[PDB]
Amino acid sequence: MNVIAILNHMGVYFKEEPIRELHRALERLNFQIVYPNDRDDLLKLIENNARLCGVIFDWDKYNLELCEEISKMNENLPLYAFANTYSTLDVSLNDLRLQISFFEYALGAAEDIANKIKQTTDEYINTILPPLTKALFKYVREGKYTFCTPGHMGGTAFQKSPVGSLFYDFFGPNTMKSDISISVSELGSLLDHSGPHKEAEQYIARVFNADRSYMVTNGTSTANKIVGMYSAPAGSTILIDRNCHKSLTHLMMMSDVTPIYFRPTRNAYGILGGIPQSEFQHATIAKRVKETPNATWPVHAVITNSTYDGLLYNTDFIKKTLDVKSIHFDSAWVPYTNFSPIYEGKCGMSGGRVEGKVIYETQSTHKLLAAFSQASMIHVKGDVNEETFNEAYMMHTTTSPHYGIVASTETAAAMMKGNAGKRLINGSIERAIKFRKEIKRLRTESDGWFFDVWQPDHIDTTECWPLRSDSTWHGFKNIDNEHMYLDPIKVTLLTPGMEKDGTMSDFGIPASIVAKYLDEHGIVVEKTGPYNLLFLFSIGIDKTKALSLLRALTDFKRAFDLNLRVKNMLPSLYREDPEFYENMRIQELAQNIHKLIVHHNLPDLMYRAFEVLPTMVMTPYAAFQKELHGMTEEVYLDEMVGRINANMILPYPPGVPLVMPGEMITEESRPVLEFLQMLCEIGAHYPGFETDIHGAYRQADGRYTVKVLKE
Amino acid sequence: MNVIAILNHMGVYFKEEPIRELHRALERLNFQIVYPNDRDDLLKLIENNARLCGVIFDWDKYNLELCEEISKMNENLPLYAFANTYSTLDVSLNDLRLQISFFEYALGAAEDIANKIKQTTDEYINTILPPLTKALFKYVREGKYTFCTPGHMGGTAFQKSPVGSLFYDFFGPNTMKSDISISVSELGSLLDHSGPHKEAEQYIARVFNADRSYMVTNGTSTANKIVGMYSAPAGSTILIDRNCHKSLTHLMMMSDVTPIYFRPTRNAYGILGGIPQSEFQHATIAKRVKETPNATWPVHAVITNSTYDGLLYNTDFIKKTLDVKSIHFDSAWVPYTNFSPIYEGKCGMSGGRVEGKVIYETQSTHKLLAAFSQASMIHVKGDVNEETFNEAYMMHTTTSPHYGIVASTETAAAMMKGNAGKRLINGSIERAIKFRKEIKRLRTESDGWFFDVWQPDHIDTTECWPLRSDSTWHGFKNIDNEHMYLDPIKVTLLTPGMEKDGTMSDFGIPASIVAKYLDEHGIVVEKTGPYNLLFLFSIGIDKTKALSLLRALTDFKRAFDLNLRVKNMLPSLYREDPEFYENMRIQELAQNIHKLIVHHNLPDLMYRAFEVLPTMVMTPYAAFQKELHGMTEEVYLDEMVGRINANMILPYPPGVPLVMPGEMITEESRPVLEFLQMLCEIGAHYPGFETDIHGAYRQADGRYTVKVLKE
Amino acid sequence: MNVIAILNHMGVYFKEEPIRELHRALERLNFQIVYPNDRDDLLKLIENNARLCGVIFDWDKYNLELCEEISKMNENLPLYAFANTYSTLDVSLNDLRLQISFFEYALGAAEDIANKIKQTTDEYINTILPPLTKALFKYVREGKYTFCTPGHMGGTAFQKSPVGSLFYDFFGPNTMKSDISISVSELGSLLDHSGPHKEAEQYIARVFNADRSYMVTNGTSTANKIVGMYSAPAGSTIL
Ligand SMILES: *Cc1c(COP(=O)(O)O)cnc(C)c1O
Ligand SMILES: *Cc1c(COP(=O)(O)O)cnc(C)c1O
Ligand SMILES: *Cc1c(COP(=O)(O)O)cnc(C)c1O
């Protein structure tokens, strides 16, 4: 932050001479001097260059063309405008947040002007930063408190060991000095909720529109277990979603509760939809209570909004139909549904406090924002006990938190405040919609097959495309209108190979081959398998990272139409088995895999398997108790009908659980077992595409083994 | 790491000319050149300067005086010794780990020598570093895999926001690039325990002498709950220590178990001793099972070794008398009991595998070592199930671990391996023993009172001082011999004010006033209150931080003997209440507080209160169930006899729990209630020394309120 | 105030090399470096030279010949003494007012040492000066309050008149900026006897051994008329 802009050359000498004298004075305090050209030149030095804090221009030249466009980007940006004798303001310059510092054209006084710019720049730094981060940066340059934790104390022990000097010189001197615990008086403690930590929690909830919010320092996987243990006593009933996370499954194994799984919607490509509106009724929930042994009235509900693919729900209908006093929303993929008018009424924070209910959200911080890993939040909207919810937060958070992540956790809430942060959320949406139009433009004009974006036929708008009932792009039968939304920054590329009715075709390329082709250039697909390609277009994807993805997609069509070899296209796959992948081309491998999907019938053995649910004998908490006593055994995959599993089956593809720990496969869940045996055959012929199931151990013959319980 | 040493000036020209030519060649690749004088000069450039990797000296001048002292410090340190024509080795140079690189004195070949030094230096970096850290540093300069988590992607989003540029320019560009998740193929995942993470768990367990060790990324407070949820089913019996931690209390409130509290020893100064040998008997444990309703055979035991003050126990006697198959040792203060011969047989890892038992330890990493915060380990010594214990670890660690802390967790185990790490553990002990002798030297020679170290009269040794039965320095009656140890790096300053029998005196200064006086110069007291001052002498405490503590202690005697004012000595205390602390001196405040301790009788109302235990009605897990249902109420402190509390009482001073959540104060625990009412009176007369109890809330009249359960 | 003294030479290289690295780091923040000779050389750099604030010497060489003579001349004078491994204090160093800052001989950390000396020097300035004078110097560097008396406002009107530029350039920029009236909130007023002016009256009386003392701004000739008009009514008798 040391860029000073000097716009507009008057041509006279009594105005350019003070500029030349100031040029030699600002460089003595480390400041970069730039000279833009016209009005459009200064506008490009703010959106692209974020390290600018000084704009020098003539006030009697552009008093209305610069005070309006700059105010729409940054409000507290200092403006070192130079006025004259006959200078005045304008009536249209009253409702604009600006910081204009006037000066004169006096010779010899250039030294006093340089001291005022440095003092004004320090005021801008001490304003846009939160008080928690301000106390961290001040303690590095001035704090000298000895005998504190940790033992390194800014890297003192690293300067005495030969191996410790390499780890300290990589990050930097200012990196280890900010690693302090609760051994500081002028910073308070995180568990005490006092001092700078008290004002930090009120600053995040005010920007994100909330009443009280904490700072989880162990990722979202930990924040879901703290809230789940607040409104679920031993022996109650919870309403967890079927499309849950690995951490959400362990929550059912740590508390003696009786969960009730929902019935989400799904298509044939593998993209899971959402929970229908009929499941939130009173006659639907109460019907499953009597059918499930040992189950009372549900007091907590876990809703995955959005899912792993990115599909927003309708919170305006759940907060009125679902009769749960503690409704939870797993907002681990949408930490931005507030800073844009196309996201109002789509989350729990949008709106107001529900009478007699409370909304919990675990907005991830390190997922789709800009902060260190292992960072999460707990958004509470309602009237809860402060002395009770505080004890549950200390059950998973240590007494010495890492302030390096805490400073970045609150930073994400400050980077989005104001018009400077709205240009990053709306900017990523405009870059995502532009990428969606570049696919349809290069599809009809191309000569052959081309990738397709899972989007409606009409994308001539900047909002969330609703999933209506008279469309064929989504392919969700019996879908509810005004309930399923689409995330514009969640572009899902649909590779050719299937039709629009859900059947198979004759010519197509699976998404597993494209996933490895993008890895050679440094692109890893977020979700691949059947015929989908999920990508993340958050604030970290600029115009360079977005255009680099389109160029790699055009190279795959050129290499496939010319029929190239595997060695001259996929060097990483050739090193796995050079003998088998010798005389093989890109067209021979793409056609042999497509025939195996039609032969084994993948879309049918996957849709019917995920629809039915195995018979849940006991609660997931009771299954973990038998494992600690040693009553577990390893059986074959073909010999397991009528047994209780011990772990959760997570087959890849897709990425959703199959059998929960504590269920039994009877005659109702017959297609469930057929889905596991089909992946063991298709993933054994060609190397590289082996079967990936988190729970199936590979032996020395080919047959996988599962972990069940003793009879 | 770029320091090259050139020792011994022969005086000739055919040997000094290649040195001058090499001086201009090594500077082109960023290397600092130093020229030591005699033999003692080179020895000071290694212990103090850890960034050295090149030693150039004549082989035919000091072939035995340098190859022996350097080998005792660093083994893999390269030695760029220059040999001659008539050069040979020595018989005494066979059992020494060195790396000697021979060269010649050729003109013009100085460029080829610089390439060999840079290549040898790169081999030294790629050897002393663990494979997990090596893969993290290499991924920064080569790995460019985009479209992955976290969202910042090396700090890309920070370059677009004005406030984000100030946070990216603080830690450094190489800091954000090293923040990656499990979205990397060549680094594996932490939950999968494969790849670099698989070899990292074996490298730590080998140095720390263990079979399997993990890396907890949420501090030690979280790792204690992982072991507690493995050998303690719902309805069993655990043996938790009375001197537990805040996280250990929440473990009893999350699992339906029946804990049995021990009876640790204690004196009058507030320093808690340890568990006697009689509590580990079979007739003592089985007697408390019948007296406690709903209690079976104990299957798990939690032993706090060491405590908060630093007192090692006797693991050689516990592992034979205590009949518990799952014995836990809370080693949250001794992460170094395997690098010195004066610590053998004092921890659970020392020795061998116990037949039919298993030892669990939670060594703290960010306490007395050198690593980032929120880092812990789980040491397992026994025969446990791998597929069962792994599920308990994933119930508290997120799926995307922060590799910045994981790389530093294994670094702490790598910085101590070899003789280079033994000089830091034994070096901190030598600096601690030297500090203990400087107190007794400045006590008799001084003219007046002086601080005293809680140590025996004979400290003329370098080992752990045992607590015998014929000594008066410890003041623990009915103590067991060869069971209580002393940590030399845990110096506890005993301020004058009490006698050696446990009564009170006439002249003394409390430790609370000294605690605030040390904060002015930059010294934070770890534990204070009655008449004790606990400090931490880790590896980070060098000779500068050690000598700075003695100077501040001598300044307190000078300011007190001359009778100075509070405003001219304690500026922080004067700003709290300038009106009351106006006409007050340092002698008037030190004498008024000492009379309040004798009047209210603190040592008697604290020793008898901690001895007796309240009547535990229900288990701590059952007390948390009534809090979620809204059956709590706030009552006065004077009206609570016969009620069940909801929170844990943690009064300061000292720092140990008083009443556990789920206990009742009857007629047996009468002194327990008197201890809470005594602190409310002594901490209300003079500002700054208010009553600090983690459980009692301050109202608007003076009387504190507690949180109990409804009848 | 920017003179740093480095006394004695141990002759070794692991102690003189950190001195050479610190020599190039202290000059970047405007600090003069002097190299005294023997013990009598450092004593002449304190009584004669008053702009000195840093004394660097070996702790294991003159631990009693320097900590006694310097204490007899200045109490809050910082002492940047470098200690070693086998270093300790003396029993005759308990009743002496000194400010000893310990360091090491580590290479590469010369930049961090320069930041500790600059902050220690700033703490020395903010301690020996009274709070009234300290608040006046900070108001000049940090103070953009407009529409206040007097009319010059740090010398603003002097930059417009040709004759006024000769009077403003004679004293200095920091001279006219320190001439402020009671138009400042964080400095209080002299007639109100509150804020910094309240603590200044109690500080002067404590130095000159008194209970209360004011500050007359019109010489002694005016102070004699204030006391005379307090204990001499109309028609009384004075001696
Ligand atoms: C990725 C994810 C998590 C894990 O996020 P972390 O911050 O790494 O713990 C938890 N829940 C959901 C729904 C996720 O998608
Ligand atoms: C300090 C301490 C802890 C907490 O350590 P962290 O690594 O910060 O989690 C836990 N137990 C004991 C006994 C402690 O002293
Ligand atoms: C010199 C003198 C004065 C005048 O002093 P000023 O401070 O200039 O007013 C007054 N009284 C006596 C006795 C003097 O000697």
Numbering used by the authors:
A (entry chain G), B (entry chain C): 1 to 711
C (entry chain E): 1 to 239
Lines from the paper:
Building further upon these results, we now present a higher resolution cryo-EM structure of the LdcI–RavA cage in the presence of ADP, obtained without symmetry imposition. The resulting two classes, with an overall resolution of 7.6 Å and 7.8 Å, respectively, both display spiral RavA hexamers bound to LdcI, but show clear differences in the presence (Class 1) or absence (Class 2) of density for one specific LARA domain. The apparent flexibility of RavA in our cryo-EM maps is accentuated by the disappearance of density for LARA domain 4 in Class 2, while it is clearly present in Class 1. A pseudo-atomic model of the cage was then created by flexibly fitting crystal structures of LdcI and RavA into the maps of Class 1 and 2 using iMODFIT27. In the LdcI–RavA complex, the RavA spiral seam is oriented between the two RavA monomers that have LARA domains interacting with LdcI. This results in a seam that always faces either towards the upper (orientation A: “seam up”) or lower (orientation B: “seam down”) LdcI decamer, and never towards adjacent RavA hexamers. Therefore, the occurrence of only two opposite seam orientations of RavA spirals inside the LdcI–RavA cage may be explained as follows: (i) the lateral RavA–RavA interactions impose local geometrical constraints causing ATP hydrolysis to occur solely at the active sites formed between RavA monomers 3–4, and 1–6 in the hexamer, or (ii) binding to LdcI stalls RavA in an inactive form by preventing ATP hydrolysis from proceeding in a progressive fashion. In addition, alongside the observed alternation of RavA seam states, a comparison of the cryo-EM maps representing the two classes of the LdcI–RavA complex reveals a near 10 Å difference in the distance between opposite LdcI decamers forming the central cavity of the cage. If, while bound to LdcI, RavA is able to exert its potential protein-remodeling capacity, then the existence of these two classes tends to suggest that ATP hydrolysis by RavA would cause a breathing motion of the LdcI–RavA cage, thereby transferring mechanical force to remodel substrates inside the complex.
